[PDB]
Every structure is written in structure tokens, then in C-alpha cells.
């Protein structure tokens, strides 16, 4: 009913859907585990996968008018409604569970802050899910309040993220002597010269780092998810998604190098730990920074780039501003996924290729708003939160986004190589073997990311294919 | 030019192509490693895969007239000439390399017999390849002598197998006291009661047993390989292949249970090892059979169901008859594969879907005899013999037959489930989901048998697909 296009929708939705819970919490630990010279490489590899998927989605976008939904209609019209429906359903489930993961990360950070600050609630183990129930109810309420309300919430949350990043960079740029027990020392070149090497940890490897980091990098093409509600389809999507991926990669690289050069892996924060600069053996950069707060090798000391989780916030002044940055990032990501998934399910139900899902069709609202999809995603997310401890199935579903991207790329490759009556791409570049390379990279990542879960993913895709084909749509 | 059908071709070719080098050598060791209660199970599982593949091939056969070749034309006419050519090429390569491995196993057994009997040649390590070259020359000479010549050789070789099995069963049925140091004791119930349990060994497991045994069970549907030279296509193939698989499974089960109940895992063959039957502790079945030739647990003793390799021959009188049995079986299997592969390559080259293979087309001879394919298979086999030590790449090519079977089963499933204009099966049974279940078994076995080699097989199939698609045949 309301046509809004490139700027607001694409920019803020991509910004706050790629910027997940990882950025402020997991990034510091993952860059303290792996040096900058290799964290940059892993971010660049994930960026390569992301940008090839974006180019592939843009290639499908410039073909022609999109009826609606996301990957579903694209895969259907390109390489068969059976694959289209399978990919749409699997990706909708992936997004519906990513909603629960985003909001449970929100729950973890909020309960950690609450417990640290003043008090704690009864049964802190499940207090995360307890607060998650109410915050998911609130998120559903604000999401089902039309599109203008959610757009306003998205833009103000992006503003909050921008102010949080500004506070972070301002705090790091200005050195403070109060953080002598901590790793923050003010961009000392000693910390930089000791961080460009891949200095791993006890049990984490390159592939463990990649599987921890990657779910942050997914959430792209959210504009393509809701292509049926954009003012300028087939034109805004490429120029928006490419710029969003570029800026997100740049900000990840910048924050990674800054936090790597700003902190140290050995910060024994304690009252006794001072900057006396005692004439010790000086094997580590501790004495080069401060004589006290050293000797973390013998026993596991307090924290610092290896154990701390509020390092990204405590590095800069006004810690509540950073914490609100975490809250806004996770809430915005959950909102973006919770809006993207049900309209895709509506696209699935529109063509009636699934006889069983007669319901969950177009309902109330001035536009084609799938409220029933909103309730369905609400219930799925609530059930998965009630399950709790999502890390166990985190790499089970980490390859469902891989499945979606790989089917996108393979569909583009099949439509380009094998001539089709209506392929007719329009975006200017498109060496079509790049889509094949992206598909191969997606499959390689799938096999790396819990190969058993990958095999289960192909089994589920084949089951969906045989189910939809046996139903003989007509 | 000559139409010969069910009896001679189908019967003898299936008998002598499924009956490979394994039966007389590896079977005794594998049944000494895996008990009857589990060896029967593994044989039955391989039989289930084999018979599902046979039923699937029969389903394709009764559709209509076959132009020629094997899985190539079937897969093409069912689900695309691209997959047809990919499957035909990969299966032809698999058969061409299996020829080399069959003949090098023949080389191993013949050089072992020669070294044991009178003398040995220089450089016994490569004496196997030395004799293999000349015996491959003899094989190509007898194979390129028309169809009647190879049929006569095949039938006389199969007769030799019948006499070998008769000698074996006659020797086992009649107990001999001369084999007291050996495990042959005359169907004593003590040996049977102590062998029906899955008594494994140091490092071999169930899946190692499966990967060792399975290449014996492959070689089926050789009549379907040469469907272009059969008197009664689409009618003889099912009733022949099913009966051949049934009888081969029955003879494997019978020989396995007989050799299990006939020998023991502890036969310390030595002059001191007698049948004195001393009153020892008698924890093992040795003293239960004969007091001497016991105590093989402390140190690795001579042989017997765990180390012996000519036990299948020494169990029965007239060992040279058994040795001729091995020779005839391996020569017949190599001949069958060396006849099946090049006509399939001829079918590949006939449709010209591979433009680069302009040569290797129909040549001299009264019938459509692909001599150029004979030389091609000769060169590939000679190269792989010169490579030597084929066991390293045995699990590599073990999944190529799995690939052919899985694609054939998926062909039947896709043609039956997804409606096709000309499916029209005629064989009576066909609960169509059996094709799906067999395809799933084939994929699971592929993953078990060197999952990395399975992944390589999928990569090669995808490469062949994209190569044949990019060439845009018209
Ligand atoms: C299939 C989609 C998965 C989304 N989950 C996710 C997204 C991001 C991100 O970058 O947006 C980062 C991570 S994380 N903490 O680095 O592993 C994620 O895993 C979570 C999130 C919170 C709780 C436990 C696991
Ligand atoms: C892809 C097809 C392979 C066929 N090769 C094969 C067939 C059979 C059989 O049952 O016909 C048994 C075996 S074996 N000795 O059990 O491993 C085989 O592998 C050999 C053979 C001899 C030397 C080393 C490996
Ligand atoms: Cl996605
Ligand atoms: Cl085969």
C-alpha cells in the first residue's frame, strides 16, 4: 500500500541485519584468539562469499519484475518451482530460528548486565529465556504495527549504533591512564607489533573461528527478502546491497584492527597490578606496557582479550552507551529477521505449491501483510527460546543460510550457462563463472561447518523436493 | 551381426563378472575376520544394493528398445543426455580400471603360486606387472577375436569354475586326518558354535569388511552393458540378471558358512603340532579339536583363517584344480569388464555429445565392433598396471560403481515420481520407493567407502555435467 525504496529500507535494514550480536561481544574474543593478519583474512573470505551472493541476487533482480518474497520466487522462476519452494521454506525456517538466536543473545547480554550491575533474578540459568519471552512479545507487538513504525524503529536503532561506534572510536582514540590494569593502553606500537601474527589458542582453530564468526556476516539481501514491498524493485537492490556489504566489511576490518592494536592478550586486572615497570625478565609485552599485571601464562588470570566480554565496552568511556549499542544491535537484527521471514512464507503460500499450507495466506492490513506468518514465526522463536542453549544447534542451522546462498548461486549459474528464454541480465560486470565459484565456496563452507549438519541439510532439501514433486501441483 | 540372447550371454557373463578374484582368496580371510552371523549380514546388505540396482535396470530395460551401450543411453533417455554422457564416461573409466586391477590380482596369485611351487623371477615386486603385461596382451588377443570366440572362452571358464566349486565342496564334505595341523577338521560342531559370533580382529571393523568385500559384488548387469548385441533386448535382461544375482548370493552364503564351519582361526601348522589331544586347560577350540597346534594368542603363529591365503585350496584335494579356479575366475572377470567398457564408450561416441571424441567411433568388423575402444581400454589398463599397487586407489574407484548405481536408481525414481511421457514400465512388482531406498543405500555406502573419494566423485560428476552442458550439443 505504501511504496518505500532504496535509501531507508535497504540501507537501515541491511545495516542492522548484518550487524548482529557478534560485533560488540564475540569480535573482541575472536580477534584476541587469532591475530589481525588472519582475522582480516577470515573476514575477507566471508566477505567474498557474501558479495558473490549479493551479486548473484542482483543478477536475478535485474532480470524482471518480482512478484514478491525473497529467494523463493527467484529460484522458482529461474530453475524450477520445486527448488524455489524448497529454498524458500528452508530459508524461512532458518530466519525464524535466527530470530530466536538473536533475541536469546539479547537475553544473555541483558541478564549479564543486570546481574553485574545491581541484582539478579531467581533461576538465572533460565532467566535469559524468562526475559526473552517478554522482549519477544514486545518485538512482535512493534513489528505488527505496520511498516512505518518498524522503519522508524529501524532508523533510530541505526542512529543508536552509529553513536555507539562513535563513542567507541572516541574512547580508543584518547588514551586513559585509568585502564593500566586492563589491556587498554592507547594504541601502543608494542601491542600492534605483537598482534599481526596468527597467535592461536589452546583448542580453537581457523575453522572454529570461521564457524563462530560467520553467522554475523549473514543477514544480507534483507531488501530482497521483502522485494514485494519496495518502491523501486530490480533497481535499488544491487546498488544498495553492494554498498551495504562494502561498508559492513570496512567497519568490521576497522574495528578488528583497532581493538587488536588497542588491547593486549594478557591484562591481569587487579589492584596490585600497577605500572611500576619492575625490571623483570621481560619475555612478554607486559613489562613493555606495565610491570604489574603480568605472568598470565602460569595460571589463567582475570581477563583481557582472551576472557573479557565487556572489553569492547569498557575500552571507551560511557559504558552504558556501548551497552545500549549491544541492545540496539541485537534488537534491530531480531526485528529485521522477524519481518523478513513471514513475508517469504507468504510468498511460499501465495503460489499454492504446498496444498497442506492452505492457511497462512494473505490477510488483514492495507498491504499484503502476512499476520498469520507473524504469529507462526513468533511461536517458532518462542519454542526455540524455551529449548534454550542455542549454541548446540548453532552450526546445525549455520549451513541453512549456506543452503540458501548456494541454491541462489547455482540457479544463476544454471540459468546463465544453460540458455534460458528469459535470462536477460542487466547489471554491468558479471563474469558468470564467479557465480559458480561462489557456489563452490558455499558448498565448501557447508562441509567445513559441521559436515554432518551439511549432509542433513542436503537430505532435508531432497526430502522437500520429493515431497513437493509427489504432490503434483497443477 | 549375430544375435545371441538370454542363456549364454546373460548367464555366463553375469556369473563370471560377479564371481571375481575375491571368492577364492579374500573370502576365507574376511570370514575369519567377521563371523557367520555378521558375514551373512554384510553379504545380504551388498545383495540388497545389487538387487535394487538390478530391478532398477530391469525397469529401464522393459521401457523400450535400447539403441546400445549400458547406463549411458538409459540415463540419457530418462533424465537428460548430459547426465547420460557423464554417467557413461565415468562408468566406462571405472570398468577400464577394474580390468587392470582384476588382471593385476591375477598376476599376484600366479606369481605367488610360481614362487611357492618351483622357482621365482628377478624383481618379484614388479614380476606381477611383468607377467601382467603379457597376460593382458593375451587377453586382448582372445577378446578381439569376435563374439563367438569370447563366448566359448567364457563358457569354458565358467565350467572350470563349476569344477572348482565341486572339488572344493567334495574336499570339505570328506574329512581328512592329514590336515590336523591345519584348521580343516571335518565340519566339527565345535568350530561352528565358536564362529557364528562377530569375532573381529586387531584393526578391521564392519565398514572395513564392507569396503573390502563390495568390489567383488559389483560387475552385475554386464548384459545391460552390451544391450546392443543381444538377441532379445528388454526381455532377457531382467529374468537373467535377477536369477544371476540370486544364485550368486546363494553360492556366496553357502561357501561362506561352509568355510566358517570347516576351519578354525587357530591352526598352528607345524610338525610338532599333532592331534595328541593333551589334557590342557581348553579355553580355546584348538585342544577341543587337537591338543597340538595351539597357543596362537601369545605370539603370531603360522596361519589359519587369519593369515593363510591358500586355505581355500588346501582345504580340498587337488590344489592345482583350485588354482586353475582362481585363474579362470579372474581371467573371466577381466575379460567381461574389458568387453563391457569399450562398447559403452562406443555408445558414448555414437551420439557425438562429446565433440572432442570425434575418433573412437564404429570401425571394422561385421557388427558394430569398437576396436579403437579396445585399444583405449588396453592402454588405460596397461598404465594402471604399470602404476602397480592398486589397493591404494581401490576405494577411490569403489564408489564409481556406486555412482553408476545411484544415478540409475535416481533415474528410475525421477522418471516414475515426476511424470514422463514415455516411462511405461512393464516388470511386475515395482513398489517405486524401492528405487529411492536403493539410491539412499548407494549414497550411504559411498560416504562410508572413503567419504573423501565420494566427494571427489561428486566433483567429477559435476565437472562432467558442466563440461557437457557448456559444449551445447545440437
Ligand atoms: C543461522 C543464523 C544464526 C544467527 N546467530 C548469530 C549471528 C551472529 C551475527 O554475526 O549476526 C553471530 C552469532 S555468534 N554469537 O558469533 O555465534 C550468532 O550465533 C549466536 C548468537 C547468539 C547466541 C548464540 C549463537
Ligand atoms: C571398482 C571395481 C573393483 C574390482 N576389484 C575387486 C573385485 C572383487 C570382486 O569381488 O570381484 C574383489 C576385490 S578385493 N581383492 O576383495 O579387494 C577387488 O579389489 C581388488 C582386487 C585385486 C587386487 C586389489 C583389489
Ligand atoms: Cl539469506
Ligand atoms: Cl555397473
From Swiss-Prot, chains A, B:
Subunit and partners: Homodimer; adopts a domain-swap conformation at the scissor helices connecting the transmembrane domain and C-terminal domain.
Phenotype when changing residue 389 to A/C: Slightly reduced cation-chloride cotransporter activity
Shown part of the complete sequence: 282 to 755 of 1212
Glycan-bearing residues: 272, 281
Residues annotated as signal peptide: none
Effect of residue 20 to C: Impairs transporter activity
The organism of origin for this protein: Homo sapiens (Human)
TM region(s), chain numbering: 6-35, 36-55, 87-114, 125-148, 152-173, 206-223, 239-260, 318-342, 371-391, 392-410, 434-451, 452-464
Compartments where located: Basolateral cell membrane
Predominant localisation class: membrane
Mutagenesis / variant outcome for changing residue 219 to C: Strongly reduced cation-chloride cotransporter activity
Tissue expression per record: Expressed in many tissues.
Protein's name in the database: Solute carrier family 12 member 2
Residues in the Extracellular compartment per record: 115-124, 174-205, 261-317
Record's disease association: Deafness, autosomal dominant, 78: A form of non-syndromic deafness characterized by congenital, profound bilateral sensorineural hearing loss affecting all frequencies. Some patients may have mild motor delay early in life due to vestibular dysfunction. Sensorineural hearing loss results from damage to the neural receptors of the inner ear, the nerve pathways to the brain, or the area of the brain that receives sound information.
Role of this protein: Cation-chloride cotransporter which mediates the electroneutral transport of chloride, potassium and/or sodium ions across the membrane. Plays a vital role in the regulation of ionic balance and cell volume.
Domain remarks: The RFXV motifs mediate binding with OXSR1/OSR1 and STK39/SPAK.
Effect on the protein of changing residue 212 to C: Reduced cation-chloride cotransporter activity
Family label: Belongs to the SLC12A transporter family.
Amino acid at each position: 500500500v505504501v511504496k518505500f525504496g532504496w535509501i531507508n529500507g535497504v540501507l537501515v535494514r541491511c545495516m542492522l541485519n548484518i550487524w548482529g550480536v557478534m560485533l560488540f561481544i564475540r569480535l573482541s574474543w575472536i580477534v584476541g584468539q587469532a591475530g589481525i593478519g588472519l582475522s582480516v583474512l577470515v573476514i575477507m573470505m566471508a566477505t567474498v562469499v557474501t558479495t558473490i551472493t549479493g551479486l548473484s541476487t542482483s543478477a536475478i533482480a535485474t532480470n524482471g519484475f518480482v512478484r514478491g518474497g525473497g529467494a523463493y520466487y527467484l529460484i522458482s522462476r529461474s530453475l524450477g518451482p520445486e527448488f524455489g519452494g524448497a529454498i524458500g521454506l528452508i530459508f524461512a525456517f532458518a530466519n525464524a530460528v535466527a530470530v530466536a538466536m538473536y533475541v536469546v543473545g539479547f537475553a544473555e547480554t541483558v541478564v549479564e548486565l543486570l546481574k553485574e550491575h545491581s541484582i539478579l533474578m531467581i533461576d538465572e540459568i533460565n532467566d535469559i529465556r524468562i526475559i526473552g519471552a517478554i522482549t519477544v512479545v514486545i518485538l512482535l507487538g512493534i513489528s505488527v504495527a505496520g511498516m512505518e513504525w518498524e522503519a522508524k524503529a529501524q532508523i533510530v536503532l541505526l542512529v543508536i549504533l552509529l553513536l555507539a561506534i562513535g563513542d567507541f572510536v572516541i574512547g580508543t582514540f584518547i588514551p586513559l591512564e585509568s585502564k593500566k590494569p586492563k589491556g587498554f593502553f592507547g594504541y601502543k606500537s608494542e601491542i600492534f607489533n605483537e598482534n599481526f601474527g596468527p597467535d592461536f589458542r589452546e583448542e580453537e582453530t581457523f575453522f572454529s573461528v570461521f564457524e563462530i564468526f560467520f553467522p554475523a556476516a549473514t543477514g544480507i539481501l534483507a531488501g530482497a527478502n521483502i522485494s514485494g514491498d519496495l518502491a523501486d524493485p530490480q533497481s535499488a537492490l544491487p546498488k544498495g546491497t553492494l554498498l551495504a556489504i562494502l561498508i559492513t566489511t570496512l567497519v568490521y576490518v576497522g574495528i578488528a584492527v583497532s581493538v587488536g592494536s588497542c588491547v593486549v592478550r594478557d591484562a591481569t586486572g587487579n589492584v596490585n597490578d600497577t605500572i611500576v615497570t619492575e625490571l623483570t625478565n621481560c619475555t612478554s609485552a607486559a613489562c613493555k606496557l606495565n610491570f604489574d599485571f603480568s605472568s598470565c601464562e602460569s595460571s589463567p588470570c582475570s581477563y583481557g582479550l582472551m576472557n573479557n566480554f565487556q572489553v569492547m565496552s569498557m575500552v571507551s568511556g560511557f559504558t552504558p552507551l556501548i551497552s545500549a549499542g549491544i541492545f540496539s544491535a541485537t534488537l534491530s537484527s531480531a526485528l529485521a529477521s522477524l519481518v523478513s521471514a513471514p513475508k517469504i512464507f507468504q510468498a511460499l503460500c501465495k503460489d499454492n505449491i504446498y496444498p497442506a499450507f492452505q492457511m497462512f495466506a494473505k490477510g488483514y492490513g492495507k498491504n499484503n501483510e502476512p499476520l498469520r506468518g507473524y504469529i507462526l514465526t513468533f511461536l517458532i522463536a518462542l519454542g526455540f527460546i524455551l529449548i534454550a542453549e542455542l549454541n548446540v544447534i548453532a552450526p546445525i542451522i549455520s549451513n541453512f543460510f549456506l543452503a540458501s546462498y548456494a541454491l541462489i548461486n547455482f540457479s544463476v549459474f544454471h540459468a546463465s550457462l544453460a540458455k534460458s528464454p528469459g535470462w536477460r541480465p542487466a547489471f554491468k560486470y558479471y563474469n558468470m563463472w564467479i557465480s559458480l565459484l561462489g557456489a563452490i565456496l558455499c558448498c565448501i563452507v557447508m562441509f567445513v561447518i559441521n559436515w554432518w549438519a551439511a549432509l542433513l541439510t542436503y537430505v532435508i532439501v531432497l526430502g522437500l523436493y520429493i515431497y513437493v514433486t509427489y504432490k503434483k501441483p497443477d
